[PDB]
């Protein structure tokens, strides 16, 4: 009975070269370790080391510190996959449920509610694009819808459509031997993104996402019957949550996202070579109870041989709107806006005549981005469990279910915005819809910039909280922390607004204190 394990000569020689510098042999170093005994080694070297190696505590006062620097540049453009506040719906009254009926049949039904179309004209060019291709694509689509007979619609690969969907734009792949000597063979552009300046529209968009609407946008599937008393309590509270969230504008964006990304992913997978039309549909229930089918526009899917999870599908989005693009032209850099008709609109006691625009743009997405768009309903969970924890925290202290007081009274309110008058407070329902909008916009505008800004600025927020808790906070390299934050504020509209929100918050804290 024995056991053996030894180094052959090759490894023995590697063993000898993987030691601290002062040792010539592995057997030697193994003996130094087996016999070592500490005799003030750390204290000695600590006396020897330069006293420039230190961590000086600089105390942290949020009255001392500055606002984050936001970048300068051209203004940030819209970059969502679909229109938000600027969207316009053609709709029909329809008993159909939250996903029933043939999409293109529904779409044609919605079109057939609107007359007063026009010969289309370009009213705002996509400066970097061949705008008459956008014009011809709309007309091609409109006539192909007219002439379709089936469940799905595949457009012919015309020149104007091939262009808008980037057909053939991939450089042809060669072996390096065959192209070694080309002069302008360079490595792909790999600069950091160009900076951009904060613009009005993203704050406006968020205000509208936080509002209530007249329609229930989200239908919920069934639960098992309630039995436990806590389940009855839960369903009571879930009633308040459901209406507050289903009727919020951000939930409409959720359902637009879930529909578009679901339709794109499925068509991307099954119709890889077809230019397939996808109508932008939502179903909703009015507060009056009427069920309704809405049509926002159309999407033309390009080829979709998606292999890697980042691979791109090019698509064209053709979306109705009453918004005049010229009033905010920096918002629409990527779009070519057409004027396609005129609409008679009811008011209180007068009919108004407004022109109908078509926001057109080329765009792209990926399997990973589509996957996360299909899952955007989890935004509901982010807001609601924060709300429910607030209701539950008081319920613990008050020792009663504070659900009904919070939603029906207004004795409890929280700061959630600023007007010229100053800091405005809101009810728990408003808080719910603001946090829902925040979570929905994190999903619409996901970006590495947001990831970096959120994680690093969380540290600065916690430092501010420590001071306000009277816990005597201290930093080591506060300047480096600001750099880690500001490094992430490059060009994204949503991150720029969050950076601004932090400054507004910092400023509001400084006032109430000193």
């Amino acid at each position: 009975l024995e056991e053996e394990f030894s180094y052959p000569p090759t490894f023995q020689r590697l063993a000898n070269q993987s030691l601290p510098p002062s040792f010539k042999d592995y057997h030697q170093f193994k003996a130094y370790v087996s016999s070592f005994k500490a005799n003030g080694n750390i204290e000695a070297k600590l006396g020897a080391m330069s006293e420039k190696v230190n961590a000086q505590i600089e105390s942290f006062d949020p009255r001392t510190i500055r606002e984050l620097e936001l970048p300068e540049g051209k203004f940030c453009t819209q970059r969502s996959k679909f229109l938000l506040m600027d969207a316009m719906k053609l709709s029909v009254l329809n008993p159909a449920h939250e996903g029933e009926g043939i999409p293109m049949k529904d779409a044609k039904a919605c079109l057939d509610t609107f007359w007063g179309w026009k010969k289309a004209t370009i009213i705002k060019k996509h400066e970097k694009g061949v705008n008459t291709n956008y014009l011809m694509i709309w007309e091609q689509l409109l006539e192909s819808i007219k002439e379709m007979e089936g469940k799905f619609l595949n457009l012919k690969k015309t020149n104007h459509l091939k262009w808008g969907l980037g057909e053939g734009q991939a450089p042809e792949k060669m072996d390096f031997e065959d192209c070694k000597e080309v002069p302008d063979l360079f490595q792909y552009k790999s600069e950091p993104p160009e900076k951009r300046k904060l613009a009005s529209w993203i704050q406006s968009e968020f205000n509208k996402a936080s509002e209530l609407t007249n329609s229930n946008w989200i239908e919920f599937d069934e639960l098992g019957n309630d039995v436990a008393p806590i389940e009855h309590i839960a369903s009571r509270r879930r009633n308040f949550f459901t209406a507050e969230v289903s009727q919020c504008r951000a939930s409409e964006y959720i359902m637009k996202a879930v529909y578009i990304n679901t339709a794109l992913l499925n068509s991307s997978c099954t119709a890889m070579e077809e230019y397939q039309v996808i109508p932008i549909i939502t179903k909703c229930r009015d507060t009056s109870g009427q069920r309704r089918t809405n049509l926002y526009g159309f999407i033309i899917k390009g080829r979709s041989h998606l292999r890697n999870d980042t691979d791109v599908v090019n698509f064209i989005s053709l979306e109705f709107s009453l918004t005049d693009p010229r009033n905010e032209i920096h918002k629409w850099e990527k779009y070519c806006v057409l004027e396609i008709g005129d609409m008679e609109i009811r008011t209180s006691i007068s009919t108004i005549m407004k022109p109908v625009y078509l926001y057109v743009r080329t765009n792209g997405t990926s399997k990973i981005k589509m996957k996360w768009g299909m899952e955007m309903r989890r935004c509901l969970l982010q807001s609601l469990q924060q709300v429910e924890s607030m209701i539950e925290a008081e319920s613990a202290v008050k020792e009663k279910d504070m659900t009904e007081p919070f939603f029906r009274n207004r004795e409890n309110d929280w700061p959630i915005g600023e007007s010229p008058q100053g800091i405005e407070k809101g009810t728990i329902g408003k808080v719910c819809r603001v946090l829902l909008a925040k979570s929905v916009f994190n999903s619409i505008y996901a970006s590495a910039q947001l990831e970096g800004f959120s994680a690093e600025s969380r540290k600065l927020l916690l430092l501010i909280q420590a001071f306000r808790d009277n816990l005597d906070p201290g930093t080591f390299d506060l300047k480096g922390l600001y750099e880690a934050i500001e490094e992430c504020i490059i060009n994204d509209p949503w991150v720029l607004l969050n950076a601004s929100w932090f400054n507004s918050f910092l400023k509001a804290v400084q006032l109430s204190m000193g």
Binding site: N239, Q247, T287
Partner: peptide, 6 residues
Amino acid sequence: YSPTSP
């Protein structure tokens, strides 16, 4: 419950 806003 019918939510409302000012």
